[PDB]
Amino acid sequence: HIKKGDNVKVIAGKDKGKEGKVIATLPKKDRVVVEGVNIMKKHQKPTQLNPEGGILETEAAIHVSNVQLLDPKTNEPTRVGYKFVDGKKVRIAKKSGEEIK
RNA sequence: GAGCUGUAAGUAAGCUUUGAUCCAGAGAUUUCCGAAUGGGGAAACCCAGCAUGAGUUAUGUCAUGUUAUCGAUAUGUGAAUACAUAGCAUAUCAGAAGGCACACCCGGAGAACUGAAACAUCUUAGUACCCGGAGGAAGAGAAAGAAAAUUCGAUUCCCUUAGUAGCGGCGAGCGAAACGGGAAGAGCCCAAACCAACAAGCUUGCUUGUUGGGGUUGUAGGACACUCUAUGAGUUACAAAGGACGACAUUAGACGAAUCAUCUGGAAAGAUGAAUCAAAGAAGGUAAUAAUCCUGUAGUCGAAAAUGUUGUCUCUCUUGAGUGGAUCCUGAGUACGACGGAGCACGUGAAAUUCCGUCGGAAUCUGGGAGGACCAUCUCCUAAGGCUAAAUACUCUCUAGUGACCGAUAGUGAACCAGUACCGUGAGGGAAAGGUGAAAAGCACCCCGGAAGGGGAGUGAAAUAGAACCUGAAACCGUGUGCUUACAAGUAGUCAGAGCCCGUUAAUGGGUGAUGGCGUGCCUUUUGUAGAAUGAACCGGCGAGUUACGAUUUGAUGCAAGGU
RNA sequence: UGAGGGUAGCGGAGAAAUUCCAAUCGAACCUGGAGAUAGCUGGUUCUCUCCGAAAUAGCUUUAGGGCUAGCCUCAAGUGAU
RNA sequence: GACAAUGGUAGGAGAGCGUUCUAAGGGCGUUGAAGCAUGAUCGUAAGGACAUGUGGAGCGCUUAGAAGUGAGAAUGCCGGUGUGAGUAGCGAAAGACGGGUGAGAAUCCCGUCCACCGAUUGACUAAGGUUUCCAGAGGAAGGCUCGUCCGCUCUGGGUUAGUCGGGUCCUAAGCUGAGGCCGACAGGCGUAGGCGAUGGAUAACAGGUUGAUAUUCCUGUACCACCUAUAAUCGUAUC
RNA sequence: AGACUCGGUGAAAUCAUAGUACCUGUGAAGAUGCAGGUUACCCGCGACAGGACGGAAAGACCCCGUGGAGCUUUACUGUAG
Ligand SMILES: [Mg+2]
Ligand SMILES: [Mg+2]
C-alpha cells in the first residue's frame, strides 16, 4: 500500500497537513516512519561513546492508516488500485487515473 | 513482491530486484532409547559373531552389511526301529506382535453399599471395574415369520399403542409386542441328487479320494424326460477379479464501490455543515464512537502439482423359460424329551417359542415345524451352512460460524512456557500467577548517599500512570487539631439538657456533652437463655428449594358436541 | 550386625501382646462405583400489609419419626342452621 | 363523612424495591461515563437522586421478557490485617587483647597468650547426596543478632589409569526361561541355556608437585597379556 | 544456667463489642454486667494462683440409632472341602 520513496500526506495526527517521505516501514505492526512527523526528544544515555550530555531527536513511527498517498493533479491525496496487462501489477490512483511510481 | 536473521529486545558479522524472508504440494536427511528384534540391562547404556572396506611391516581400533521368537510353504537329513515318523540344518516371507480417541458397538467373565423404612428370594444391575476382538461404524437380516382379511411379504431406528396385557415375600418395584403413521428400502451364494477326468477296484457303482460342469425353493423346487431360445445382459460394496482421457470438490492466492472543510482536544471516527457508494450498513484495528483511512465483506476469479469423489470409455465375465410324471435328492448324533442352570417384560408357574452341560435319541413330501401346557381338523411356513449397502450410535481431532454462555476466588486443574514449582519410597495428590502509555519518547545533567531510596530539572494529555507501574474500598498502624476527661461502679446507647467552637442541599440547622431518668449484646435450640448452654478475632469476596418428562388443581385464552 | 534376595490385604509374618507390615492396623494406602446412605446435628440471603395455630386422640419393629382425625389459612357454594 | 378494625412465633394469602442480560422506542458522554469518597436531601419500608473532589470510556430512564437474582453466623472455604507483646525464645560448650581492613567491627583476616577432645571433636575409604570443591568481585534475600564474612548471589576455572574399585572371566540365595505341562481370558509353574557379588580368580611401587586432581601428571627402577622381526634351532618336537 | 534492667532480632495458643469492684439477695434453681446497699483518685512494673462454670480434644463413661465393625455358639439361611 505504502512503501519507501513516495510522498505521503498525514490526514489524522498532531502533525497533520504535512507532506514528506517514507523512511522505513515496520511491516508487522503496520507502522511507517516519515521524516519531520512525530519527532521525539530521547533522553539518551550520555555515557555512550558518541555524544557529550544531550538529547536525541529521531522521528517516531506512525500507523499506516494515517498517511495517504497523493497525486496532486487535482490537489488531492487519493487511494490506490491495481491494473496489470504486463505480468506485474502497476499501481493506479483511482481518483485520477494516472500511473504512479 | 522488499525487507529478513523463532522468542529479538541488544550489538556483531551478513544475505536479497540474477526475486531473498514467508506460505502450500511433492521428494531427500531422520543420531541413540523404545513391540526392541544379535546376546545382556537398573530405558536413553555396556559386550559380540561371520562377510566386504580403510588403516598399520603387522595385531589393537573404526565404517557400511546383516543375524530374535513363534507359523508354512518349501529343500535337505541320521533318527530310538530295517522302511519311516516326532528331532535337526538352511533359503525365503510388506504374514504376526505394540500404540491407541479413557467416545460409541459386539462377545467372555461380573460386585457392593443402596431401595424394600430391619432382611435372605428381589431391586440397585447384567451396571462399575477387568479381559479379548475389531470397525469407520458395529450388531440383526432375506421368514420352519407376524396373523385370523377378498391377509401382507427381510432387518434396523423415531412417533403411537402404554405405564394398558402382564410378571411380583402379588410387597417394593420390573414392563412388553403385533396392528397403524413414517426415515430408509437390493437380495443372493454353497451342500445333496448328479454328468466328465485322473491316482486305488474284473470293483456292481460317473456314487468314494481330489478337482471342474450342474443346481437353490413352498404357488413344491430341483436330478432325470421333452422343445425354444443361444450377443442381449456387465459391476470390482453382497453376487469372480487387473487401466486411460477431463468434469467437479479440498490443501496456497488475486481483484473488490464511495468524505471533504471547520469547533472543543494531547489526538476526530464526535456534535454542527455540506457529499456519495450500496448484490457490499457482518466483524476487528487505527491517538475517543468510521458505510467511504486500513485489513476486509456481497460478488466474481485461480492450480505446477499430490490425493478424493463420481459420469462413459475400455476391459473382464455370463443362458433364458415351460410342460411332464415313474425313479433319486432336498444339511444327524441333528430336532426333541427327563435331571440341573441361564435367557426371553415373565421370579418353575398350567409355561409356549430360544441357547448351554450331561446321558438317552428321530421321521424323509401321504414328510417336518408353529399359531403361549397339551390333542383333533382348517391356516401360514420350510429348522439343523454362509456372505450383504443405506436409514442409526459417536468426536481426540482439521475449516467456516453462531450464543438473552463466563469475564481473572469466574470459565478448563491451566489466559502467566501447567499436570509445572511442591508433597509421596510407590500408585497417586496439586495450587499459585493477568493490565505503564496512543507511542518507550523507561527519568540526560546537578545535588545528600558506600549503595538503596529520594528532590529538583526534563519526556508525557496526566508520573498525585516510574516496571512495589489502570481505578484503589474496608479492617489495621500513623501524624496533626475545635469540644472534652485525673472522687468515679459504665451491654457503652437513648430521651431531657446548660456551657463552648462553627456555618449547610436553608430547615423551626451541624459538631462536642458537665448533670438527671429509664436500660442485663446478636443468632441457634427450648416448657424457659444476660445466661456460667452452641457458634463467630476482625474486614472483604465466594457460599443453599434448581431444571427436565409426567400428575393434579387454580388463573388466562381460542374454539365449543366437538377440541387437538 | 552389613550386602543381595523371597512371602502382600478374603492376604503375609508372629518364643503369641490383637504384636508388626513406610510416624495409622479387632483388618494398610491410592484412584474408581459415589454427589453411597442418614427418621440425627449445624446452615438457609429483600421489604411492608391482613388473618394466625399446636404440644391432644387412634394405630404403628411404635415411643425425639409417620399417616388419617382435631385446631389455623385462601377461594367457591347453601344461605340463619 | 359517617361508624369500624390494625401485638403476634410455625404457617396460608396479597402487594412492592433492587441487581446482571436481551428485544423495541427515546436520551445523556472527553465542554467528561462507570466505579470510589464526603454531605445537613427525598419516599409508608426495601431504596431514588442531586452538589463539589478523585477517575479516564462507556452507561441510565418508560413497557415487556428471562434468571448462576439479594449474606451476620454453616467449629463454612481462599486472601488480607490485628490482639496476645515489644512478651516467650535465640538450639549443651572459654574466651582475652595488640594490629591492620572498612562508609560502618565484641563477630571477618594475621599475630601472641589461654582453655577443650585425644578408643577421638584426629587421619583414609564404602552407602548416600550431585558442584558444595577452588580464585577473583558482591551485601537485597537466606544465617535465630551483627557482618567487610560464608556451604548464599554474579563471572571464570576444577575430576588424566594396560597394573587401584568394577565391565570384556566364574558361580551362590533369588530372578527369567526355547520346546513342554496346567488355567473363563489375563496368565501361574518348569527342563537345557542365560542373568546375579556381599565371595573365588586377577600383572606397581617409592619420592616430587598445583590456587583446586594424584599408585591417574613426571622423575628413577619394574612387571603381565599380545604382535613383529629373529639367531643357537629341534623335528612322530609341539596345540 | 533461665528469670530481673539495658543493646539486637522477635513468635504462639486465644478472642461477640468492653470504661471489666465487693456483700446479701433474685434468676435455666452456682452473677464483673439485674435490684438494694457499702467501699473505690488516673496510668505502669516485679510476684502469687481463688474466680472468669479459664485454654487444648462435636464426653472417654451411660442411654439412643429398626448406625457400623470384630469375635462366638446346639440362632436362621447358605458354601469351600
Ligand atoms: Mg459388556
Ligand atoms: Mg461472662
Side-chain angles (χ1 to χ4, degrees), chain A residues 1-46 51 53-101:
Chain A
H1 182 68
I2 290 300
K3 58 179 68 179
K4 64 180 179 182
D6 284 326
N7 294 320
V8 295
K9 180 176 182 292
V10 178
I11 62 167
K14 182 168 67 179
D15 289 329
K16 70 178 175 65
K18 288 184 180 181
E19 62 183 2
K21 290 180 68 67
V22 179
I23 300 172
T25 69
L26 284 74
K28 290 183 181 179
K29 290 182 65 66
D30 292 327
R31 293 188 180 274
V32 304
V33 177
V34 177
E35 64 183 2
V37 175
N38 193 5
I39 54 191
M40 295 188 295
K41 299 177 180 66
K42 180 176 176 64
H43 290 79
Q44 68 184 356
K45 282 84 174 63
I55 293 179
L56 178 60
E57 293 183 356
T58 306
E59 303 91 4
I62 56 184
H63 192 271
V64 76
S65 68
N66 294 326
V67 302
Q68 194 172 6
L69 182 59
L70 54 78
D71 191 4
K73 291 184 181 294
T74 61
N75 292 314
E76 181 180 357
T78 63
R79 289 169 294 179
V80 291
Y82 288 148
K83 294 290 184 181
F84 59 99
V85 293
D86 299 328
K88 189 177 289 294
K89 291 183 176 66
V90 175
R91 181 171 59 248
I92 304 300
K94 294 192 292 183
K95 295 176 183 174
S96 297
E98 297 293 328
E99 294 178 351
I100 65 178
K101 176 155 192 172

